């Protein structure tokens, strides 16, 4: 009935509380910081073998092996140092939108338009990779998936929900609801206690893995948020959307901290990733090239052109030595 | 320079060979995207089967005149089409099913969906095969009710021939390119072979046009 009035009053109170703790801006504080030079990155390796659009990829925790999922029903696992194909996994459903690599490295994950998250065991005594789990229960397509501890996995789906699954059982341990549009991406905190999810309602939400609540929501974008990633510290994150912005929010301040727009860019943003120290922000666009931003000064510091189509996936190794970018021209490039 | 990395390179080369063979085998197949609204009549089209638990996508596999067809039905997604339609950019053709027996302006929403799909930024070259289903029920409906309920601006009389032709021409004119893609239309009949023959002919024409573009003759 009139409960909309109470909701609007609470929203106004939240806005006023956020305003009351906004004394300065990060740009003003960092205006005295010496800028970084023109970040020049060169392509070291090019990985060939995919015959369709590469839709997702993920680094291993050893910063040497990486999994790559493509629309030809392939889940190729590469050794990046020598460009050797360690594994080639065929998928029952060729419509894949995400892939993940277990922190230990014994499992990989896959998912897509079939609403199923498949967990494949890499280390078997038979010498072949066989599917070990086929988690099902999501109604929409799967947009992202991330391993927690080789037995728990968080999956965001296109039915405006997320789930936490226990792999050995196959049932959703927890279900996260509250988004209005499709959840397009998620990222885990470094301690794997919280995770942020960005949805198509131009909103991001911080969820507690344990006891499954939504702690705080962040707005400010004008379109669907396609990518999200946590700061290395764990107290901030960055979200890229279709309005050509890479807005960086802070958890503790509960406010927007910085926007990374530019008049030249007019496209959406597909992937967002940070550096080891958090001083650089790498974002993949539809201009077929990636951009590097000074995370503290919102100044572009380099371009990673070299792809003939939309850059769909982007990631940085845990040791931070290289950056892997994969695009729709069926090629993955390592930059250093 | 290599001690047992040579065997790793050999394994990688074998993997590459397997990938190449699988890619060729997959590229030697025809892929179609089945689309339509609710109660459109996709059942009478997918009933021509000649060869899962997930309610996310349906793959119908069949063959005709040694040609291999895989048809993808994505009607169990209920999400925004712009989120996952780009996955079907390289399909050979779209197969759009429209029911002629509709009234809650169902034909209006079918026309809106057709206009949205045809003028999509991804399907700027893929052809569309239009299947007008339930022609006999439409004939009974027009014998009972006038066509002016759906289109009050209709000037012709009320007979199956001219009304069907008017609907077909309106759907054809709903296209906004008319220069890079073609629309093939068929009125679905009770014979199980005529529909597949029409699909085969349209696919052959699309293949010929694609080869003309590839060979530099266009």
């Amino acid at each position, epitope marked *: 009935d009139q409960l909309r009035q109470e909701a609007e009053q609470l929203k106004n109170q939240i806005r006023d509380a956020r305003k009351a703790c906004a004394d300065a801006t990060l740009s003003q504080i960092t205006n005295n910081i010496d800028p970084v030079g023109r970040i020049q990155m060169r392509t070291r390796r090019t990985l060939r073998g995919h015959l369709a659009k590469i839709y997702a990829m993920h680094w291993g925790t050893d910063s040497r092996l990486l999994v790559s999922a493509s629309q030809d029903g392939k889940l190729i696992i590469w050794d990046s140092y020598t460009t*050797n194909k360690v594994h080639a996994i065929p998928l029952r459903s060729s419509w894949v939108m995400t892939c993940a690599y277990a922190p230990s490295g014994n499992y990989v994950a896959c998912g897509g338009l079939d609403n199923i998250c498949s967990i494949y065991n890499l280390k078997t005594r038979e010498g*072949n990779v066989r599917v070990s789990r086929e988690l099902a229960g999501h109604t929409g397509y799967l947009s992202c998936c991330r391993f927690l501890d080789d037995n728990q996995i968080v999956t965001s789906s296109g039915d405006t929900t997320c789930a936490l699954w226990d792999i050995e059982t196959g049932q959703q341990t927890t279900t996260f609801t509250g988004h209005t549009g499709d959840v397009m991406s998620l990222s885990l905190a470094p301690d794997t206690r919280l995770f942020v999810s960005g949805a198509c309602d131009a909103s991001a939400k911080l969820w507690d893995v344990r006891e499954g609540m939504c702690r705080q929501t962040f707005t400010g974008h004008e379109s669907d948020i396609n990518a999200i990633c946590f700061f290395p510290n764990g107290n901030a994150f960055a979200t890229g959307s279709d309005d050509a912005t890479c807005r960086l929010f802070d958890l503790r301040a509960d406010q927007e901290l910085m926007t990374y727009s530019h008049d030249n860019i007019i496209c959406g943003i597909t992937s967002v990733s940070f550096s080891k120290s958090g001083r650089l922000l790498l974002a993949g666009y539809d201009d077929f090239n990636c951009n590097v931003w000074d995370a503290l000064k919102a100044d572009r510091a380099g371009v990673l052109a070299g792809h003939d189509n939309r850059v769909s996936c982007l990631g940085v190794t845990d040791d931070g030595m290289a950056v892997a970018t994969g695009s729709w021209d069926s090629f993955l490039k390592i930059w250093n | 320079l290599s001690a047992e990395d040579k065997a790793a390179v*050999e394994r990688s080369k074998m993997i590459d060979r397997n990938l190449r063979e699988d890619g060729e085998k997959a590229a030697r197949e025809v892929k179609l995207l089945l689309l339509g609204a609710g109660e459109s009549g996709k059942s009478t089209i997918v009933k021509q089967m000649k060869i899962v638990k997930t309610t996310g996508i349906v793959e119908t596999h069949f063959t005709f005149k040694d040609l291999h067809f895989k048809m993808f039905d994505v009607g169990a997604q209920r999400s925004e089409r712009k989120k996952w339609i780009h996955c079907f950019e390289g399909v050979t053709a779209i197969i759009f099913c429209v029911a002629l027996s509709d009234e809650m302006n169902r034909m209006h929403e079918s026309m809106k969906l057709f206009d949205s799909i045809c003028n999509n930024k991804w399907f700027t070259d893929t052809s569309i095969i239009l299947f007008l289903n339930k022609k006999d029920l439409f004939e009974e409906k027009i014998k009972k009710s006038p066509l002016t309920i759906c289109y009050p601006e209709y000037a012709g009389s009320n007979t199956y021939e001219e009304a069907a032709a008017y609907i077909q021409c309106q759907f054809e004119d709903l296209n906004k390119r008319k220069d890079t893609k073609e629309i093939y239309t068929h009125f679905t009949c009770s014979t199980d072979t005529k529909n597949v023959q029409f699909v085969f002919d349209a696919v052959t024409d699309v293949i010929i046009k694609n080869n003309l573009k590839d060979c530099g003759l266009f």
Partner: single-chain antibody
Amino acid sequence: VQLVESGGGLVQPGGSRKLSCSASGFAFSSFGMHWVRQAPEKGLEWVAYISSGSGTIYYADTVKGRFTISRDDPKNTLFLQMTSLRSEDTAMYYCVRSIYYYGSSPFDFWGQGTTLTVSSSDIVMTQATSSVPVTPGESVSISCRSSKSLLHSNGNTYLYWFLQRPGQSPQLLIYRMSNLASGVPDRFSGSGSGTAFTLTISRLEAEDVGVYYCMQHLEYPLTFGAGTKLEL
């Protein structure tokens, strides 16, 4: 997972034989296969190797020319055809599987082997000690030494430690000098540098008695060197 060998027996000198190795329980097409022979009361000696897909084939010097290793993948079988069997070929032959990629463990599984009896430079691995008297509950150190450094430019030291219990086929313990195999108890450990390597057993039990062998995988001749016996 098992490999069963057949075709052994007694052969007159100058004859011919065909040993067969049937594999069941694993993807035979993805594994390279070695034939390794052990003479009566002597150390193991590498004989032959055929890769996956039969791309590359390697033979030992003593058996090159008169031996031929082949595989048939549809039927999951490995063949060793040997002619002109001299009196020095009497041994027990073992069928070994090994897969090679990044982080793999080659030589992980050994067949039971078959006995064949016949009537009447590159690199060397040295194990100075041949037998030590040991008691349960104490730590043992077994040392191995090579003529050429096993370290490579990619950071890998290609040294493998195998254990052969009395009356059983050898079982892999350590690969790449520092990695514990699958199912090997934690108490086993391996270390070393370049030329000198050591294997340590912390608190042994009655199941650790047997012969320990070191093996190199840097240059393909694949020398072994006589093992060290642990009893009592």
